Amino acid sequence: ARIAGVEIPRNKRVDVALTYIYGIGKARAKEALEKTGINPATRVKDLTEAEVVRLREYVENTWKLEGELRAEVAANIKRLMDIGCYRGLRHRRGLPVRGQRTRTNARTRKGPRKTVA
């Protein structure tokens, strides 16, 4: 049914269809079905049609997630650009932030090789 209001991952297993939400993976699924006593070993194709909303105002209140998360993400960075620190420059210049090596690798901050020869 209409599960996670924002995104909807119907016709899958709950706990795991949870994981496919910007901010959900595994232990997030643990405390959920261990605070709202709803059994995890279920689908969504046939459950009690009331156990759809009890996960909302729990998951959808205390913390932040989905579109309500990349703000903080986008937050803790623009500053670091406008702050002039060397770490802020990392994100910009196509470079890594947990300081690796750039004589090789660092494709994950790049994406393509460019050769030039």
Binding site: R98, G99, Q100, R101
Partner: peptide, 24 residues
């Protein structure tokens, strides 16, 4: 830099003894 100074990555290259490991 896997196992060096100021990141967090991985230690199957730096070891751990004397590093932060229990002594006495």
């Amino acid at each position: 830099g896997k196992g060096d100074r100021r990141t967090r990555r991985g230690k199957i290259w730096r070891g751990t003894y004397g590093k932060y490991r229990p002594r006495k």
